[PDB]
Paper text:
Tripartite ATP-independent periplasmic (TRAP) transporters are secondary-active transporters that receive their substrates via a soluble-binding protein to move bioorganic acids across bacterial or archaeal cell membranes. SiaP delivers Neu5Ac to the SiaQM TRAP transporter, which uses a Na+ electrochemical gradient to drive transport. The SiaPQM system from H. influenzae has fused Q- and M-subunits and is one of the best characterised TRAP systems to date, with key functional and biophysical studies informing a putative transport mechanism driven by a Na+ gradient. We determined the homodimeric (2QM) structure of HiSiaQM using single-particle cryo-electron microscopy, the first structure of a fused TRAP transporter at near atomic resolution (2.99 Å, with local resolution extending to ~2.2 Å), which reveals new details of the transport mechanism.
Numbering used by the authors:
A (entry chain B), B (entry chain A): 1 to 615
Write the structure that this text describes.
Amino acid sequence: MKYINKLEEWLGGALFIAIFGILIAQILSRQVFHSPLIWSEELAKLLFVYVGMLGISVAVRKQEHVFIDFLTNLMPEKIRKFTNTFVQLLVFICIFLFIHFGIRTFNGASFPIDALGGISEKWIFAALPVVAILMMFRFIQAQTLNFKTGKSYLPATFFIISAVILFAILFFAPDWFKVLRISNYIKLGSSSVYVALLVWLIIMFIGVPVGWSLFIATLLYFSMTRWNVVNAATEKLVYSLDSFPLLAVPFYILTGILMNTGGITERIFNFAKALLGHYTGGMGHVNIGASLLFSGMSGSALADAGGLGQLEIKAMRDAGYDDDICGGITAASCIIGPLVPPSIAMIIYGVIANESIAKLFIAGFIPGVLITLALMAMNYRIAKKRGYPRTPKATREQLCSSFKQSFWAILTPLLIIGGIFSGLFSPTESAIVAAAYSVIIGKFVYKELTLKSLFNSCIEAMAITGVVALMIMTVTFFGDMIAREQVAMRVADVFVAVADSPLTVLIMINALLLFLGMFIDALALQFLVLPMLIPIAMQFNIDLIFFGVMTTLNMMVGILTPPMGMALFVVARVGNMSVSTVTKGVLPFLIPVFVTLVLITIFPQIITFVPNLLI
Amino acid sequence: MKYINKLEEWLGGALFIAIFGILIAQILSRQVFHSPLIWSEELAKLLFVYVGMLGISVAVRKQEHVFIDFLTNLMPEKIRKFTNTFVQLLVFICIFLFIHFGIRTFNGASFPIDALGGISEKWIFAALPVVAILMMFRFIQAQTLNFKTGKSYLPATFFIISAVILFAILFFAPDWFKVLRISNYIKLGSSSVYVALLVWLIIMFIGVPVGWSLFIATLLYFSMTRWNVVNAATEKLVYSLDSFPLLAVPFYILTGILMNTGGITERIFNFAKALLGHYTGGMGHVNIGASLLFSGMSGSALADAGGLGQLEIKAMRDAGYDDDICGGITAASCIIGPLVPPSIAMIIYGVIANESIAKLFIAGFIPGVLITLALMAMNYRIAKKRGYPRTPKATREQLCSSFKQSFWAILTPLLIIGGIFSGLFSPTESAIVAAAYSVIIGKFVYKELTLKSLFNSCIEAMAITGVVALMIMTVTFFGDMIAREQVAMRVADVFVAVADSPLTVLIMINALLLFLGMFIDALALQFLVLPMLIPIAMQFNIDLIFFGVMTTLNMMVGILTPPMGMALFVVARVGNMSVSTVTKGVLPFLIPVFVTLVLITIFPQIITFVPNLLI
Ligand code: NA
Ligand code: NA
Ligand code: NA
Ligand code: NA
């Protein structure tokens, strides 16, 4: 079907541009003309729903949804074939039920959209089935290649025939499906939730994506007890994306993509080198400072690691640094980005826990500074011990010229931090302002931007957001089961004798997260673990801002821990060195991170005092 | 199918607003910032193509396409049933072939769109089939109502079955249609065009719409001689709408609709009454002046007749004027609008004849003033003869206040005329400027416009333009047949002994048009007659600007001529009087119009000298 080969990309880019313009107009009108608008937010959320659905469809087409690949890599090809067939079957079922629930909920929408002219909510609720059909088509398309390469046992015609038969049964004899209700045959009772979770773990491990396994577990739970209750909970699937705080993700991603161009990074690194280059430790300090500077704009670590390593490692190697130490420094300095705001992890945690993003950012600011100072101290100690030389002192004129060149680029982090801390802007408004400023600077003051490049960047940002959107909707759906069955209360009742001692609970949770982070990627681990943990945290009367900061730091420590750390692989690839050297170099730099984690775990006041002062 | 019940309206309104904004930006940038844009025109035309197709679809759904209804009104109901079935059959066939040719031409599009980034022309050519499917669905929908009320013999299931069978044949064995080629059975030869024209007339009279009958005639001609040649000509169907001069129609219509509000007309009429009300003839002069003022903004006569009669007739009746005279004045004064620019008829003539719209607009101004002066003279003569009284002289303060009130509204005609005459703007730019100014005035100075009202007005303007678009495309298609066979040359060769005497040819053409205008509406008559007349005019070396002006005046005279004059019916309805009295009152006022037509026919220098001076 060649004439619909770019529908999602083009339509999503158009919607993205429209939303960007709408929010820009809102901010400009409110701040300058003192003329607040009452429809901009509603329209932006309405469009964002469709943007998210389109991103999900693109990800489904390209087979990019996140999944756990630890046990998969240990399987033979023959064994992998069966499991890869099974996961396609499950995803087919998931998309079918997706379409069904979308149609039903669209038919059920009644209330109007006040503050937008009284329009009906059907406009919001219609995005689900319309894009679900396209997702089904994309899945069928991908099955052709899957079977062609020999990775699955099922062709596309099988799925087409099954879809036709299922639609016929649905539209002409739905009462037949009442034989797929597990409650007919066995009454499990209270153990239904435990069985559902047990099968959830297995299907997740065999290779099914997290976003689909979270849906399958809830469907099994409802089928096990009483099916007709699913209709009440199915509205959350759509209501989750209609959120204003969640809207800041794509714009932060776009800002990072725009600022990650080669020209800007060169200026920033040149300034940092001219500044910090002449001290004992030298290029290590330069690398840490550059990472800290880029943290204020980037919302992720791997982007920083893969954007600057080629440049930094050259300087450190040339100065006289060993390969293992330089790899370790490059890998370790990357975790600053997710901690210093803005940060995608904090946004996800706030959305899941219904906490305010601004307080999370303010609370998490300090740990970034502590980690940076500790890293500088350790780098100084190592460089002094190993007897490296000192680079020449830079003269003033080079500092002046480097600062003059980098001025506009380095101004952005101050913009964002001032906008958020002072309360002038909300996080979404701050993201919009940063994106607009970056676009202006790229187009005019550096000439590196063009309209086609901007459109491609918007498409890329939407594609990235699509992966997160599915997990968000499904985790919101799964939280319904978790809360209804009161799993947290039962777990707390089981874990007696540790109450009144929250320190032991924190230690246990930290140990569990540290152990799990060795084999599972951070992004999947967050969604896997948070829904079960947040209610248990609320059970013991643990502050949620501090809990969010602690969990985010503990998960970011994961990308450094063998076997499976993305930072290690990226650094080894970029610097052209064996992963063993990178690992041995990182080992000496893990002590500061562990010490910081211990300090914040035992002294919550450190985290919790700044946000109260500011808010 | 409830959830697609407003698709055309909403999408077309959105596209209309987008085009309006694009042209506004182009004009503002070029005139103020001296920064010409090279993509605005291409984008506007590309969007206008889709707007026109959507309008055609809406008109097809509502059954509003123009047709000749003279012979139809004389038929019994039982005899009307057969013909009404036949016309549905023919329209079904026409839409089917429309879809087929759209698909073929979209597949055949190769060249790119320079000045728009090199995009492919498939974007332009894709509008045809996509909307043709929707037109087919709307036709099938309307057939249900048609059969329900007993006006046709065929249900909708019949058409659905026929469409399915025809599509199956088209897609799986198209070589079967080669039995529908009339050239297999009889080789008519040179008489093919004559036979096609004869059947064209025959089917047109039984009530088939003009737009479909032209297409049917062309298809029959091609099938009669050699079918495969149709593919070369089918591109004009799409290329006709991709025209910049044609883009001025909807915006002039929108300007008229916006300015036809109750408040503005009240101010204009109050000013006119305060100005011209105290002279022998009085309210007649007032009515003529008000019509002249409204001509500069309105592009049609019936709109002026129906938007002002209720107010004018009251004043004339109260003054002491008889009913027949007041009806005659009201009916006669309406023909100023189509003559004084802007005018839709002149735009259509220029599009069909490839002449410049600006020259036609400048040339048609003088007759619009001669007619007004002659009408004033005749009204004075009648009022003096019948001994009506004189109204009191208005004092200065009322004149000052009426002016002060109407100032902004009455400014618009000067805006348009100055913009066009001075060469500052092209007609499309002038239309855009007038629409923007009217919107601004309605929203701010007079506080009468709202976004919903503007959207509804845009929808109405698109609906009106949809009717014209189909006739434009089909007449462009039919011109190919007319030019290929050289009908004009043969007609000229038949009509020997009149060459070297263009006066006799003009007299013959004028007599024919005057005779035809008695039974056929002006809008249908223009498309019916122009395609054959224009080549014959070119044959005799007759200037085309003068020919266009003369034909437009001759056709506008039609709406006054019984049996069938729309002006008479509208005036009788609005003034609540019998059509016989309206006719007998119009009779005395037809002498000035005939004298003006004779004068311009015998003295082309009256028309042809102003445009040469200005251009
Ligand atoms: Na960050
Ligand atoms: Na790890
Ligand atoms: Na006019
Ligand atoms: Na007439």
